[PDB]
Structure formats: structure tokens, C-alpha cells
Amino acid sequence: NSMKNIESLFDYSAGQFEFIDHLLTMGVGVHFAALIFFLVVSQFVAPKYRIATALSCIVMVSAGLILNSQAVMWTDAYAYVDGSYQLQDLTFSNGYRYVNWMATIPCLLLQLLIVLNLKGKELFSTATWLILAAWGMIITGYVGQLYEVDDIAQLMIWGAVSTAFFVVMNWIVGTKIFKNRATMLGGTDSTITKVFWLMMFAWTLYPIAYLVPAFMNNADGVVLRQLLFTIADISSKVIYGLMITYIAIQQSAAAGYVPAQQALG
């Protein structure tokens, strides 16, 4: 599976290699450092929304372990020989990223429907169609990327199929947001709109990284892609989580929860 990603095609200078290694290790520290934040502040969240901050904790660890795994797999696969890091063992690949998205994405969406105050049959209903839409996006995306070295034409076709799911998914998100924000408290009806525009931006970086092999097939594209994933990672999971948390705390205070009213105070 590693021989199917362009990373196995190029030698990397010490700067390109150590720069990629530093992006992955940094992502580990950022996520686990955020994990502590999401853990501590959970007490200041009412029981209604407390599950939202717990989902962020699960997202931080899920992303941290894979990023840490990517880093080690990045140092075990290459060795500095004759002035450049050259492949050695087939272990590094971007497929592990996609397997992670299968888990983190359902968590990122579910904590969005919690702060929106959805409940009952609608919560279980809107959650199933979104996840099935998300999984369809990730699976078809995992198939196309297997061809990013052999058949770029297939990468396009699968990227197109994956985009159909992505558009439908966002449409359901945007539809529920703008039809349920009036219920939110403490003025969070305004914050939830920015979160959606924060989603449309950070999430769109992934299909761009997915297309790096097409318009930049070289060692600098491997670097740009990992840089794009990093920027998108800390925006779809960290910054995104911080906003979800802020919303969960604000509505908690507006609902009469003392630990939340004393925290903001």
C-alpha cells in the first residue's frame, strides 16, 4: 500500500525530510496539548453538552496517535545515504490518514449536532445520513489515492465520486445549522455560523492535498501536501474543537449551570 503513494518515488534532502518529520511531531504536541485543555474544561460544561467536549478529547487522541505513527513510520522508512534520505522499508503511506478520518469525522460532526441542541429521532437520523455520507467520501477517497502513482485518471474519477458525497454532506450540515441556530442560547446563533464557514474552509484543504500528485509530482509536492494536511488538521480538529467548546460553555451559562457561569465570569 506504501508503494502506491508518491512518497516512495523521490529522495529527500535533509531539509525536506527533517521539515516533514517536524510537522508530524508538532501535530502530536498540539493535539495532546489540546487534549489536556478539552479534558480540564469538561467540568465547566453542563451535562447536556458535556459529551461535546469529550468527543473533542477523542478526536485529539485519535489524531495524535496516527500523527505520531506517521512520524515513526517516516523515520523508519528512510535512511540518510550519500547526502539524501532514501527509501528503505515499505511502511510509510497516507492510507493511515484515511483510516483515521473514518473515526474523527463522525466525532467532529456529532459534537456539532450536540451544540445545535438536536435530540431524539432527529439526532440519530441526521447522524446516520451524515456519517454514511462521510464514510462514502472517505472510502471513495481511499480508493482514488491508491492510484495516485499508477492511474491519475482513476484518481480523478474517484475524487469526483467522493466530492458528490462531500457536497451533499455539507448541504445537510448547512441546512440543519441555519434551521436550528435560533434555538441556541447566549447569542451562539452567531458563532455557529462562523463554525460552518470554518468547516467549508479547513475541510476543502483535504481534496487539495488529495490532488497534489496531479499538479505537483515531486519532492516539494510531498512537502506541500504534508503542510496542507497539517494546516487543515489543526483547523478541522483543534480550532474547530475550541469553538465547539466555547459554544457548549456559553449555552451552559445561559441555561443556568453554575460551573459554566462562574467560568466565563
Ligand X SMILES: CCCCCCCC/C=C\CCCCCCCC(=O)OC[C@H](O)CO
Ligand Y SMILES: *C\C=C(C)/C=C/C=C(C)/C=C/C1=C(C)CCCC1(C)C
Ligand Z SMILES: CCCCCCCC/C=C\CCCCCCCC(=O)O
Binding region for Cl ion (CB under 5 A): 97
Q: Which C-beta is closer to ligand Z: that of 106 or that of 213?
A: 106
Chain residues 191-230 in contact with ligand Y, contact rule CB under 6 A: 203, 206-207, 210
Q: Which residues bind ligand X (CB under 6 A)?
A: 41, 125-126, 129, 160, 163-165, 167-168, 170-172, 174-175, 178-179, 242, 245-246, 249, 263
Q: Which C-beta is closer to ligand X: that of 12 or that of 203?
A: 203
Contact 228, 209 (CB under 8 A): yes
Q: Which C-beta is closer to ligand Z: that of 33 or that of 197?
A: 33
Strand, helix or coil at 48? Answer: coil
Instruction: Give one word for 138, left, alpha or beta, with left for phi > 0 and alpha for psi -120 to 50.
Output: alpha
Q: Is 10 in the site for ligand Y (CB under 6 A)?
A: no
Strand, helix or coil at 34? Answer: helix
Vertex 208 angle, CA 204 and 210, to 5°? 115
Q: How near is the Cβ of 106 to Cl ion at its closest, in Å? A: 14
Q: Which C-beta is closer to Cl ion: that of 102 or that of 131?
A: 102
Q: How near is the Cβ of 78 to ligand X at its closest, in Å? A: 35
Strand, helix or coil at 45? Answer: coil
Contact 6, 222 (CB under 8 A): yes
Amino acid 25 reads T
Binding mask 131-170 for ligand Z (x = CB under 6 A): xx--xx--xx--x----------x--x---x---------
Which CA distances in Å does 206 have to 20, 50, 110?
A: 17, 29, 20
Q: Which C-beta is closer to ligand Y: that of 198 or that of 263?
A: 198
Question: How many CB atoms lie under 10 A from the CB of residue 231?
Answer: 14
Partner from ligand Y, ligand Z, Cl ion, none contacting 97, C-beta within 5 to 8 A by type: Cl ion
Q: How near is the Cβ of 173 to ligand X at its closest, in Å? A: 7
